[PDB]
Design an enzyme around this catalytic site. Structure first.
Site, mmCIF file in Angstrom:
data_model
loop_
_atom_site.group_PDB
_atom_site.id
_atom_site.type_symbol
_atom_site.label_atom_id
_atom_site.label_comp_id
_atom_site.label_asym_id
_atom_site.label_seq_id
_atom_site.Cartn_x
_atom_site.Cartn_y
_atom_site.Cartn_z
ATOM 1 N N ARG A 54 -1.038 -0.310 1.843
ATOM 2 C CA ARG A 54 -0.932 0.468 0.770
ATOM 3 C C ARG A 54 0.092 1.715 1.330
ATOM 4 N NH1 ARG A 54 -5.117 -2.399 -0.605
ATOM 5 N NH2 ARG A 54 -5.979 -0.764 -0.322
ATOM 6 N N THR A 55 -0.739 2.691 1.071
ATOM 7 C CA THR A 55 -0.932 3.842 1.524
ATOM 8 C C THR A 55 -0.396 4.310 3.038
ATOM 9 O OG1 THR A 55 -2.838 4.816 0.344
ATOM 10 C CG2 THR A 55 -2.204 6.152 2.359
ATOM 11 N N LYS A 84 -18.094 5.195 17.991
ATOM 12 C CA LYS A 84 -19.383 4.436 18.918
ATOM 13 C C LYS A 84 -19.978 6.081 18.922
ATOM 14 C CE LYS A 84 -21.013 3.625 23.264
ATOM 15 N NZ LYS A 84 -21.189 4.561 25.260
ATOM 16 N N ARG A 105 -7.137 9.466 7.022
ATOM 17 C CA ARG A 105 -7.880 8.720 6.136
ATOM 18 C C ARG A 105 -9.333 8.769 6.875
ATOM 19 N NH1 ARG A 105 -6.185 5.645 1.363
ATOM 20 N NH2 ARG A 105 -7.421 4.701 0.166
ATOM 21 N N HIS A 134 -7.574 12.489 -2.794
ATOM 22 C CA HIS A 134 -6.628 11.786 -2.646
ATOM 23 C C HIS A 134 -5.279 12.608 -3.490
ATOM 24 C CE1 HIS A 134 -4.841 8.395 -1.223
ATOM 25 N NE2 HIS A 134 -4.779 7.489 -2.094
#
Ligand SMILES: [Zn+2]
Ligand SMILES: [Zn+2]
Lengths: 310, 153, 310, 153, 310, 310
Positions: A54-55, A84, A105, A134
């Protein structure tokens, strides 16, 4: 240069009422007269360290409608890079030598902030960081609320759902409490009531607020109905289903609603908003999703472009 | 100042004297702020007869003065502490710890999912008073905790 | 046409001293005056059959700053294509009918070479193939070494780390041994000493080299310090940690260093280079990473464009 | 073993004087063996000069004595510290640091895979003076290491 | 009470020559005259925190042969215990209140040493603890050598394959190092040579040893050929393939071999012992796996009965 | 025939005070005088559809202690049954034709109630069915309280941690609620408070209870401190860390405690009980896990023998 030129967009508290209005002013103006080459020649990084279609899809479309290129990745499955063992700091430090801006994100709070410390001049835009911020989702809820109500002061805004964990309802309240005379209604399960730190915040401002046990109570009063997905996991299947009933929305519950009341929802919805509502004039989630492009475009335009020709 | 039971005791030439530290908080300060890391003559007096104040700790860092900002960092740990600037075997200055606004790289964010944990960053919390209860706010995860919770780590 | 026009870039041995200098000459010139539309209308394939963000992100940014488009994929999780059973040969054969050039990374040695045999005219560029070649990393180390030292002959180059498996230190030695009067220092664990086939190669050329047990030994002599990540897996946790100590770099070890000595490292680093070094004038890994864009851009420009206007 | 007769430093009546501690180690010792976690009046002096070694550290602990065992644990850090036991205002007996045969609670196993890392177990190493340096064999993983390595930094 | 009564079998290092003898001496009697009800009413925990089917099925067949009950589990990830929270100490403290003895294999060194500290009075038998020990495998080896050669002193032992990582050879060299007059032949590729700490101990005790380039040189003096598996993963595929042919045994090689010569391998064998070798009477790898059953019964018998009247 | 003969142990709710007593009364005799051949020739299915190693190893050690045979499996996903097609009813209908009793743990509530309907005449013992019940854990708790306190009436019980989700406390509060004069202290963070339905029942039966903010207030009256684990996953990391320090037990806290006071925990413990607590004589969590063996033998014994002459 505009006030956001080269500035990092990380938290909603970092922006003032005047910054929100600027962003809103632009969004509204880019929606009107598109500038498909404003960011031509820029290269932007789409770092979805935590997957989100969506984002990611929204941001990227925002990049492609302004002429910008995009490189980037999603889901840090292993990323022998970052995961890692590469420390985020080092990852940004390297990426900031390729691109001109970074949208990212991350699953941990403060990620976007830390990034800021290792990017030199490269502006980073927070597309989500843990259960913290957000900001872009909010710039888009406000645009929707303004577009539909015509103002960000003096609204009767109701917020429903998981108001205790809903990262979005916390941010929407803060921003809306930068403006004047907004009254808030907090219909939410007892186990999921609005945090106190937000309540106290409001009282200091002297903002009107009250909790409701059901939506029908504030129906005929609200201008905005902001629903949020109630995560089943947060609760017990028996508890959940016990609760549920008092918090899903059907069309019939809306007969009482004012003429201009729009139902908003960050998405995904599923159980909380019945598809019958889909067909009533009040439905505004989907339209709301489309405003994300304009909200995000205006954000990159301002950050990336010195002066904005509108 | 001047320590004397009956037996001859030292008092730096020029330097600072953090006197009146509560028992057991002394060494923490030496650890926390890494005060012992210089080539200077430091003299520490632990578990001293503060009598009126029972037992206290005491540090004397010769040829080293502390900026008032550095003095404020002591607040959470030793607020009643008095910081004395000594010159020519005499107290030229007498400061007292005061609530800072920001307390750097000494505290640990109780928020376990806070990016601050792995990465190469210094902790940094914004202090904010309330009816005299100090809430501390992590710069990164932006969460607010009570100093009781943070100080526990 | 330039000497690399339409030629395949696969191994570093395939390029001569004059080819390296051409690439370097261009890189230096594209860094200076960007040609963001040189590859406009071209479509390039990013086939990361073996995932690698650092390298994929770098290549792609290189494509986007020259006007080229990009299609491609990463991680051959299942790829019912190639993996399920499509033979690489067949995969290239099909891809070579879509794009104009192919950048690819594969887990097996000789992949990029074989590809060459099934691409007709489409130039393939090796972005890594097993423990064999990774030519682009080297074109970028050299650019960095030249940019900082001002020359590729007469250097006191030290190479530290896993010199026995380090795919990068092998390639850097070969290339550097195309130039004149380079002396090499080989500080590495006994279990991980430079292969003999490289040592013999040097002796024939009559190149100066010597192994060192610790870095402090050659500190005040080296112009370039090339460190490589020591893979823990290669060793036993007790053995590793036993070894370690004699091969990590701290800032203090650098007090002895010359004024122009730059520490380089292909990345990721983690344990081998302490973040304190991050702040000294000698730190050059991150800058080195940014030079990858110019090194890769120059490579596509030459391959794709007939004559290069510089 | 430091004597100043003008700007004087007082001496205790009973207890232990851990003298001739090489500079910068007096604090490791403090942290490592938890010498401060006591109510007794301790006094510490860091970087005090004494030409026989340049700069030194010196710790006095009132009304507290160290056993033959306790004294040995300093063998690895301040091999030459001189532990002067004291009673009635005078040294009632001196003692030097003997390399112990085993060292508990204070070292960490360099073996990443050693189980001692995530468990409620106190580490323990066997010591073995082999030509030139000291060998330390973990109790659990049994891997033997040069002491130089066991002291990570 | 016998010496081994209620004792933990953790490391071979901890066992004396007498001890060794007591175990192999009992082993032979149980192999001569079985006692299917000796350990009746006993319950033993077969705790394989790290799955090792071959070692488990063995220990368990051993436990049933004496009439004991078995409960246990394999691979903690497939288990429920110690995945995110609980410690081994809690897991042992709890299990020691159920069973009469604990068998356990665990991915990390010292894991059994630590159990003996929370087991209370329940005796802990080590079935493998990381790169550290494996008591039982060695007693089973020693019992096969004694049984075939008739003695543990004055032997001609060649050890082959991965002498650096093979925990098994290290341990057998220590146990044999406790008996008199033995002589060892260490044949291994340089990258996989026998560690110094073993040689140092061999030299300190007066024991003869000597590196050799191929079995051929030693085939005729040697009494026991202890082979091991060089895992191609402990190397570079190319590297492995070059030294492969130097440490692989064909039945032809066995030609100039003593009648009494036996070929041992802890197994699994893969390439190292050619299949034609199975038909020659020197092959004893399978009869060795078989003797594991007895060495294991002896220990379980010794540890749980104050007195044995075999 | 004893009352429990051939009966299904599904819910604690289903057991009477007499029943409870019969089980704990038998439990003590088996703990006093074991019967290793009572259930000989019997076969019992240990069916863990949801893996729970700690509960399994227990039930199974219990089954072997009475001379029973065990067959069973762990985790249906690792199993073969009920993954896509077959029902539980078919799976039970079939297994009831093999074994003499069924033990089973299953991810969903009512799973055992349903088995008793297709088991035919084979008795079903519930080892856990979702958020629903866990009979055995409670009988094991009750036997530890009776054994240490000497009685189940007139007790001072404090219950701590996650009282909302902890299926274990709910169930013990019901069982104790069957005895006279008990008094409860419920100490839990508000988000994890004891459900209303328990309080309602406590009030309806005349039983005293009272919420408290910290153990400290109650430490001196309390006889039994039942602790539970607040899983940080049942909350928000930040939220968890704030209330953490209020429900974690240090051996210091135990200072003003009755001699007879015991500390219980179903385990696994992680942070809630500090390790120094293990040395104080109040720690009884491990001796509790130990008594599980007896409470479980009693039940298996009662359910399969018309008469016991212990
Ligand atoms: Zn934080
Ligand atoms: Zn160890």
């Amino acid at each position: 240069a505009n006030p956001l030129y080269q500035k990092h967009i990380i938290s909603i508290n970092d922006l003032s009422r005047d910054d929100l209005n600027l962003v809103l002013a632009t969004a509204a103006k880019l929606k009107a007269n598109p500038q498909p080459e404003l960011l031509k020649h820029k290269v932007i990084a789409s770092c979805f360290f935590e997957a989100s279609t969506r984002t990611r899809l929204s941001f990227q479309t925002s990049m492609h409608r302004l002429g910008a290129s995009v490189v980037g990745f999603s889901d840090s499955a292993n990323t022998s890079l970052g995961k890692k063992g590469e420390t985020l700091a080092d990852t940004i430090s390297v990426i900031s030598t390729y691109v001109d801006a970074i949208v990212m994100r991350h699953p941990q709070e403060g990620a976007a902030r830390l990034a800021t410390e290792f990017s030199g001049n490269v502006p980073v835009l927070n597309a989500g960081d843990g259960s913290n911020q957000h900001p872009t989702q909010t710039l888009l809820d406000l645009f929707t609320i303004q577009q539909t109500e015509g103002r960000l002061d003096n609204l009767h805004v109701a917020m429903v759902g998981d108001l205790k964990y809903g990262r979005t309802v916390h941010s929407l309240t803060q921003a809306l409490a930068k403006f004047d005379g907004n009254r808030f209604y907090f219909i939410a399960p007892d186990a999921l009531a609005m945090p106190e730190y937000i309540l106290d915040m409001l009282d200091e401002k002297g903002i009107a607020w009250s909790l409701h046990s059901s939506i029908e109570e504030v129906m005929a009063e609200v201008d905005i109905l902001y629903m949020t997905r109630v995560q089943k996991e947060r609760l017990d299947p028996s508890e959940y289903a016990n609760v549920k009933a008092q918090f899903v929305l059907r069309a019939s519950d809306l007969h009482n609603a004012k003429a201009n009341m729009k139902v908003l929802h960050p998405l995904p919805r599923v159980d909380e908003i019945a598809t019958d509502v889909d067909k009533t004039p009040h439905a505004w989630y989907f339209q709301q999703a489309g405003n994300g492009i304009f909200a995000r475009q205006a954000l990159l335009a301002l950050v990336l472009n010195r002066d904005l020709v509108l | 100042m001047t320590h004397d039971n009956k037996l001859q005791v030292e008092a730096i030439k020029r330097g600072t004297v953090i006197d009146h530290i509560p028992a057991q908080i002394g060494f923490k300060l030496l650890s926390l702020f890494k005060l012992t890391e210089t080539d200077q003559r430091i003299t520490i007096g632990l578990n001293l007869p503060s009598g009126e104040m029972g037992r206290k700790d005491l540090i004397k860092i010769e040829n080293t003065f502390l900026s008032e900002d550095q003095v404020d960092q002591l607040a959470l740990y030793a607020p009643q502490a008095a910081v004395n600037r000594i010159d020519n075997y005499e107290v030229v200055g007498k400061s007292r710890p005061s609530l800072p606004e920001r307390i750097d790289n000494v505290l640990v964010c109780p928020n376990s999912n806070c990016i601050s944990h792995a990465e190469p960053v210094s902790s940094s919390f914004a202090v904010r008073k309330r009816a005299n209860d100090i809430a501390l706010k992590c710069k990164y995860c932006e969460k607010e905790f009570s100093h009781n919770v943070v100080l526990a780590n």
